[PDB]
Structures are given as C-alpha cells and as structure tokens.
Design a protein. Sequence first.
Lengths: 618, 590, 89
Amino acid sequence: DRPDHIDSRVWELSETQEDWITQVHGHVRRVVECWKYTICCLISNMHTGAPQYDVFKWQDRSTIEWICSKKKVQYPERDTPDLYDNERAVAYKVLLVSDLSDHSPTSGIYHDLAFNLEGEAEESCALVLRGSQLQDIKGFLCRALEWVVSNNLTQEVVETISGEAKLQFSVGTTFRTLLKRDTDWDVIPTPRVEPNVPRIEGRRWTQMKKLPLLKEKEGPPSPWRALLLGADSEYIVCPPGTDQEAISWIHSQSEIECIRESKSTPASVITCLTSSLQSFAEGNPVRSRIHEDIIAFGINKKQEKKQSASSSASGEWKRAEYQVEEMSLPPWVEEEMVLLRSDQEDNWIELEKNAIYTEVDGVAEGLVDKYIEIVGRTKVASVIEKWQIAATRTFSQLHTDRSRITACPIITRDPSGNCQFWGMVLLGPHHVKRDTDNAPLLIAEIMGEDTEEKYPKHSVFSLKVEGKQFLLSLKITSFSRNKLYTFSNIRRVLIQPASIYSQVVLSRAAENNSLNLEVNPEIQLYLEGAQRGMTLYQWVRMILCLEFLMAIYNNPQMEGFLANMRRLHMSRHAMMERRQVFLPFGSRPEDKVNECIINNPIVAYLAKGWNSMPNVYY
Amino acid sequence: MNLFTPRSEINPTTTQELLYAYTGPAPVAYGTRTRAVLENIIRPYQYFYKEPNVQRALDIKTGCKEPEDINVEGPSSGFHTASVLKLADNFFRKYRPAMEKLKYWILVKLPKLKYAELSKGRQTYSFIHKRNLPAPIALEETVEFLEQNLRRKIGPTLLSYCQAIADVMELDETTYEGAETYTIKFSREELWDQMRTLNTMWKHLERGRLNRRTIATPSMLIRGFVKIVEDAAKEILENVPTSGVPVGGEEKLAKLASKQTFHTAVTGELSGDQEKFNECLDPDAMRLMWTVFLRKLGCPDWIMELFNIPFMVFKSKLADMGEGLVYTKGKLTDRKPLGEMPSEFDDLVRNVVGNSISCRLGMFMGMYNLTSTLLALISIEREELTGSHVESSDDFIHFFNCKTHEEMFKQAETLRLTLKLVGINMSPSKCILISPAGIGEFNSKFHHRDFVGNVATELPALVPNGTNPMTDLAMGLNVIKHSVNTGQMNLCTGALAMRIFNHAYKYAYMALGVTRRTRFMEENAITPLLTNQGASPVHSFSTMHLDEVALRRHLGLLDEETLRRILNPNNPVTQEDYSVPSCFKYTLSR
Amino acid sequence: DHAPQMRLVYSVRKPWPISMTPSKEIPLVFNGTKLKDTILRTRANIVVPDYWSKYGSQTSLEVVNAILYAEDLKVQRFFSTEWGEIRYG
RNA sequence: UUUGCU
RNA sequence: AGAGAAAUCAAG
C-alpha cells in the first residue's frame, strides 16, 4: 500500500497531517508530502557535534515559537518553513519541482531551496550543502520517480508538483486543409476499423544443402589499373643526399630510349619527364609548360573532345545507358601474390616502439615487434612504403591551383642512407575546386619486368645508369585528390594481418595458459592439394599481401563483393560445424555476390578462391 | 578466399575482419543523382500491387491495403491498418514502463526543449536564398522570417518555434525583408511547397554497397516537428530490449547469445536486412502508430496533432530531382529534366512539380530512422513470435527458441509476414537462419557461440586531427583507446595503431627526418623533449589516457626549467581535450 | 570535419604557418633564421615554439604546478595502482 | 612551392 | 588520350 522506499512513522504522520481525501489528488499528495518530510529527516539526520539541521514542518506551533525566540528567526503561519541551519542561521525550504532550472521566486522573504524531480537542485544552492546529503537526496528522488513510473502516476505527480499544464500547441484552419491534402485521415487519424492481425499464407523455408558457386566472368584479362605498380616496383640506388642531389645524379647519368610504345602514353611524353628532372636538379620542382605537356596532361582535351563529339551531332537524343566491360581473372594476380611475399635484405617497417610501464604494455610491444619481424622484410612492405611516400608527396602539391608542371619524386632511403629512386610523379596544370576532382598525373616508375598484357597503357623505356639497366614505365593517369590522401597513409593495411596474428598467438597462450611469443603453428587451409596448410608466419605474410592488393583495388565492386560475401563466409562457418543453414523463399545470396563481379581482378581472384573450396559438408 | 578460411587454430568467423577493404579509398558518387532519386520514388508504386500497376498506384493517398494484396513472394509497399493498430496496442501493453518514461519526457522534457538545438543538423536548403546553407545560418534566417511575418518574439522553447510555424502557415501571404535590402514575397501555397520540399543529395563515402544511393533532408520550417518526433522515438527506444539504438550492444548481444534451452528444444539464429527499407514504408502507418501510443498514454489532443503534423507534411512531400537524366545524341551528353523526353520513369511525369516530383508513398533514407525502427519493432509483438529480436533500422537479428523445427520455421515465416504487414520486407537473399543457434551477424558484430567480434566498419584515421600537436596527440590516443575498449582492436593491434599514429603525427609536424624544424633544433641545440619535437614516445598501451606533459614530468623527462618555459602563459604562441596549455598549443593560420 | 585533417601536412610546411601575438621576446632573426613576420596578430614559423622552449621567459613554479595539478593527479593515480599477474583465459 | 616518414 | 563506373573530371 506504500512504496518500498517509504518508512512507517513518516507514512502515518503524512496520512494524518491533513485531510487528503477532500483534495483533487487523494494519494500522490500524501506521497509528495512524505517525500519532502523524508528529505528533511535525511538531511537533519547528519551532524557536524549537534545535528546539521532539524525538522520544523509537521510539528506544533509551540516548538516553532521556541525556535523563533531562541534561534533568532521568525516563522509565520501561512507558509511554514522546513529547514533552518543554526550554524549559518539561514532558513531553507526544500521544495521539489519538475522545473530543474526555472524556479520563480514565490517570495523574497527568505532563500528557497528548489530541487529537481530526478534528484538535481538549483544552480547555486547545492554548494552550501555537503556532498553526501546531496547524493542521498538524489537517490531518494530517483527511487521516488521509479515507483511513480512503476505505478503509472507520472501525469498525476506532474500535476501535483506543477499545478496544471496548458495547450502549448494549436493548428489553424487553413493549415489543416493543407495537411489533409494527401492522406485519407484527419490530423488525428481515427480509422474506423477494429484492430486485428490477419493470417497470411506464406511460403516454406528451404534448406541450403550445398554452398553456392560464384560466377566467373569471361572476356579480356583485366590489366593492372592501380595508381602505382605493385610487386613489379624497383628502385635505383643513388648516393646519399637530398632529393635534389639524387635527382641530379639520376639526370646526369641516364640514357632513356623507348622499348615498348603504348598508344595511351606516347613516347614523346618522355620529354615531360626529363625536362622535369632537369628542373628538379636545379632546385625548381615547378617548371614552365612545354609543348609535350599538352599531350601528357590532356591540356584543353575537354574542348577537343567537345568539338569531336559535336561533329557528330546529327542524330536523335537517347536515354544514356552505360555498359561496364566484363573481364576475367588475369593470370598476373597469382604472380603478384607470389612476388609480394618475397624476402628483402632490409626491414621496411621501422616504427618507434611505445614505452613499457606495465606487463600488458610489454606483452603488446612484444607482439607488435614479432609481427613487424614477420612481415617487415617482404616486398609488400617496400611497396607499401613506396606507395605512402608517393601519395604524400603528390597530395602535398594539390592544395593550390597551379597552371605549371610540378615534380614529386619518389625517393626513400636505406638505413645506410643510400637514396632509393622508385620513380617520379609529375603533377599537371590543375585547378582544384572540389575535393573529388581528378588531378592529371604523369607517373614514371622503375619496373623489374614488363608484360604487355598486364600494362597495356604504359610506355616502357630503357634507362641506363652507370652501366646498370632499368625499365622505366610511364603512365598518363588522372587521380582523385581524396584517393591520394587515402593512400598517403596506406600503412594502416598492417593492422588486419596483425589482428589475425595476435588473435592466433593469444588463443594459443590461453590454451596453454602461458604466453609464447615465438609460436607459429600450422594453419590448415583449403590449398591446391599438394599441401594441407601453412605456418602462421607464411599465412600472415600472404594475408598482408592480399589485403594490400584489396586496398589498392578497392572500388564499389570490391566493397559490394566483400559486404555480400560475409553472409556466405558465415554460412560456410556454420556448415563446418555441422549446423544447418535455412533460407527464405526465393533467396539467392550468390546473386548478390555475383552482381559485384565485373572488372576488379582482385574480386575475381577472391571468387576463384571461394569456388576452389568444398561446397558440401557431410 | 581460401586464405581467409582457416581450418585450424581460429575459425572463419575470426577472419571476418579480413573481408574488409576500408583501408582503401571509399567510392564517391559522380554527377546527376536524378536516376537514383527517381528509382527510389518509383519503387514504392511498383510494389503496391502484386501485379505492377504504377499508374493505378499513383492515386493512393494512404498506402493501406487488405492482406490479400500483400505480396508474400516479393516486396510489398502498403500496410494493414488493423494490423498496425493491434501491433501498436500490443507494443504499448508489453513495454508499459517505457511508455511511462515517454510520458514523463512528454510532460516534462518536451516543453523545455530549446530550438537552438535545431542548429546541429545537416546543411539546410533555405526557402528564400534557394541555396543550401549551414544549419545555424538557415535557422537564424527562418527565425527572423517568422518574427518579421508574425510581429512577435518567438520564445526560446521549441514548442514556441513549432507554434510560430503553425501560425505563419495560417497567413494568406508572407514577406521577408532581406539583409542589402531586398524584398521576398510568398503565397501560402508557395510557402507550403517550400516547407514540404525535401532536398536530396548523394550519400558519399558509404562503404559496403555497389550502387550509390541518395539521402534527403527536410526544410527548416518542419525540422522542429521532426526533432520532436525523433526525440520521442529515441526516448521510447532507449527503454526496450528489442532495439538496436546505440545502447549497450555488448551486453545486449552477449545476453541474446547466451540464451539457450535445456538442450532438448530447437534454437535458431536469423540474421538479415530489410530490402528497400525506406522505399516501402508509408508515413501514414508511422503516424497511426504514434497516435495509438499517445491515445493509450492518455495524452492531450494537441500533443497528437503536434506528433502527426510532420508525417502529414512528409506525405505531401516534394523530392528534388537533382539536375536531370542524362541523354546522348551521337557522341554528346546533355542533362534534361524528367518530362521532356521518354524515359523509364515516364509514369511519374504527371507528378512533376517544377523541378520537384510529388510522391505520397515511400520514404527517403536519413529522415526517420528511429520511427522506422519503432514501426519495425511493433510488428514483433504478437503471440506467435516468442523469440528475441534486435533491430538496428535496416539490420536485424532474431533468436528463435521453439519446441521443434516446424515451430521454428512457422515463427520465422510469421516474422517475415508481420514485417510485410507493417510495410517492411526482409531481403530474402540477405536473410540466413542458422540452426542450432550460435553463429550470427548484426550491426557489423559477428557472434560465434560465446564470442562477439566487434569488427569496425571503418578504421580510425590514424593521423593528427590538424588542430595542434598537443590536442592532436590527445585526440589520437583517445580514438585508439576508444576503438580498443570497444573490442575493435586487441592489445597488439592497439599498440600497432599507436605506433602508426605516432609516426604519422611526427611526420605531420616535421620531426621525422631532415626538415627545417629538425635542422633549426640541431643548429641551435634544442634537445627534443616532446613527442612532436622528435623525442621518443612516452605514451604506452596502458597510458593512452594520460596527458603527455604530466607524464613526462612524473617520469623525469621534463625539468622544472623546461616546464616553466613551456607552461608560461605569457608566451605569444598560446591559442574531450585535456591537454594542458603550452607554447606547443599554437593555432595554424589557414 | 576532415578538411583540417587533410590540410595539416601542407599547413605545417607553409612559410609562416603559426599565428602569434606581437612580442619583443621573440627576435626577428635567431642564428640566421627568421622567426616572426611583420606583415600588415602577426605570423611566425614552426620553429618558434622550439626556440621558446629553449630560450623562453620562465614563469614561477607555482603557475606550473597549478596548471599541471589536474593531469598529475591522473598520472599519480595510474602509477600508484598495482597490477596483478596477467592471466590468459 | 625549395626538396629527407623506410 | 586518360581516370572511372550506371556519370562526372580532363578548368573557368
């Protein structure tokens, strides 16, 4: 009959303090008055040696007169106060209102202590009181509100502690006419239909007995289409020095002649490179426009194509439809995967270690060190460094409109200090107005091997530096600023394989209840058939290479394919555990996957890998 | 892909984080969005009738239909009025304490809401300048227009803003004095069209989809009602176990994963997403659900009108078509608005209003998320469905615990049918039921037995924010710590991310190699003492939350003289972020 | 707001990236490097904070303690806590 | 716009 | 030319 947070003596006194049945609220009035008196009792319970305060309400006027005479105060009969601190000789009334902030002064005779319904108080009142009593009041009011909501008395309590509300919104007549123009119901919808949930004859759920196969597309093999090269990236070793010195050394000793010419990148464009290199050797990365630049960066090509199109304006307008050219898994993806995990004589992931203060810190640093040692000396790490440096140097030159050719060399440095010239990136005359605009680039890179079917649009020249021979591939690209910024920190690709490695190591540690940061067990995989698994280190290296390729070839096709392959990955996991997979009517997840297999060579590689795995589990 | 399918040590669920390419550049949407917008607008009408009859469906005001017209084999666009009423009543009766909390919000929190919070939204299409502007300037312009046309001082409370809107709408005509004094006129119909016009835009950087999809934003005249309804929806959703709102997802998913019978029953885990989720809902169902809730709550009448107004305006909406459909004449290319030339969307030509198209059915993504989630959740309430359910807007996971497989399949089909009943279609190809339960996916969190991997949708940008060295270091360490304690990165990956961010942060402030800053510090013998100066990092995995200066002082890496020089407030270089002020807290010019 | 994030590297490498108030305690040139720009707040280069850390005007240790008290509380709380044997399971 | 992240 | 993908940049 009473809340669990209400005592007996206070309850009985509140029930007998007034005639509550003659008022509008017969129950909540008693409850709120008892709450106020319980707050008074709790605040007065504490002491300094004398009690902090003392209860005044709900007592005869004799004690009121005695206190007034002694404690230097006067208390009228209309609105008797409830609390009075003698240490400060100040009278406070602990009233609770829904308005946390709005506390209009009912009277100016004495200070008023208004409290929030949820426990809070005024802006400049709780400071005078200590902390523990504030927490007690907060908890009591929270429990009070909990009981109120439990017994569906929110509106009644709000009325009790706030008088009555008012209609704070009203809608006119013409506005109602506007609102009721496109719906069969009025502003307050009252469909004269009995509520009822009917029964509909559905379709049965079919079981997925065997995993689906993904469609493999046919057509020309997909050529390499990344911004820069992958495993076929090399560098020229130059004496230690600044970028200008290295470029001058390269320019002085260089005999460049075309080996293979591509129609997309005419050999004449080589003049744009050397002329740039020379300029960069003199200390001016920005260079004046020359004739070849027109072909190199498509200067005025917009108007040229506009005229070449208007020349064929004799026709009829048709709804412009687009066709994406389907292509098959090119054979160079497997070769790229093999070459990306080849060893290197140097470690290409040199990140400063964090500080160690705790055992957890030591374990984390050990795991990171082991991971870096595992994947640090691979071709993929060097390619990642090359990509990051090239992207950073190219993106740093796209913050201002420029009508001149810029030089952005790709030069790293070995620990001994020798410069490593991976290539060059010439930035054409750009006017960056939108962050997604495509800046024109002429990218020259040092290759290890040339394949016409893999680099159809690259022009390959020979480059002789002090006897040594190199291949220099030139490509006329147009790349978005956003993608350049994204690749500026391509180093994040190291996180996912690190996640896998750390999870495996920690699982082994938990199983053995003793961390061993040098364990590389055999991971069983669905490989060709010659072998039945790999070591943990080799698997981590392969994962890093594949993830790098996925990041480099990330486009809408890749995003859709990966998003829709998680369902099938989960289905395969369920089947591996002899669970059952059931599907709704007319369900075909393989269709969702197949919608995203068009051009992306890496997506085709992943689809082929999926197809090679068993599609039935017994 | 077989490389991503372990058969030992770990499982394919563990390697689910490998099926992500967020480390690569997210795709962007190019050129005109008219095709996507028109497809979104036409999808609802093609699904209203089992036999696609768009023309017959263009006259339906309230998308209500009988259960005989609901397509159980393909997407359905309408809703059942009686089913909506009964399901809303059941939802009210089940989560009654949530209704009480909502009533407390309505009777206490709602009146005090301040319209200034309206200035924290997407860019708004001002109905005067006819060009998109940031939210605060648009709010100021709208308020000034209201005050000028009403001759009153609109109160700070949000209800005053809404009442001011409802009052200006009664005016036969309105005028705005520009400020540069230029007058602008408005007829009641013109202002009504401006208020009910949603401006569309490409959803950029959206990963995980092959096709680009658009989103819509409302006017500033109706954003107050939208905010009221969305706040009410949030308040109700925070107090129900079936919601996927940003609540303690770890606790929720773990609790549902642990659920099991006495090992004799049949358990199933259905993971799925809704197809055409926004392109099938009807605002009439949403407002009817809200009206049922309010009426059962004993709320006053003006409250119900206030809650219904935004959905009424959305029903009579006007979607901006963008720039036009692309056409080619030989080798040219020209954008033309719908209507001039034949196209697949010719059925909608009758709905064209200027450059905006009128549509009563369907909805646009990014406008009513919480209301859509509430509509989805009310469907789950009925005697047949006795399993658990979690819904995050378009994603959902259901846990069936039945006596036999037949009951489980019946409950699954009943769930699908009820969702169709309220206007929500589960994508059949994206819905997978595993039996026995234990493996599932939801909201990019993958559950296996008793392990939930919270796979991050995006990697943290492990680069300095660009404010200043100290602030950037603090923010980056905080981001890494947050991503760690949410399960998105374990200790090794957290330390690796710390190292990567450290390298990027040192590079951005010219401290890694031979630069002007390092050359200056070497010539004048300024020993590097801070992280941005090139000193070795002082933070660790365990100390990702501490401040660099205090940590260095405690460890003895900073001396009282250096601290006094650094922390001198009289230096001319002075400007949750808890980085103490210092000479290294400068502000960049541009 | 990714705009400042993608502009930091370029912003820091500008000729006069930092904006500081005029002050004679910052010399026009130090050891042959121009620090402040007397353009028509004034502009300074990225080496000004380092030059200040090495030659700035020291303040009273009381101000330093007042500034650093809040963070030193957390640092001391962390370093005072004792962490038990790390387990695996 | 002067050029050095393994 | 080229970048790219269901339509845009390759200036104005």
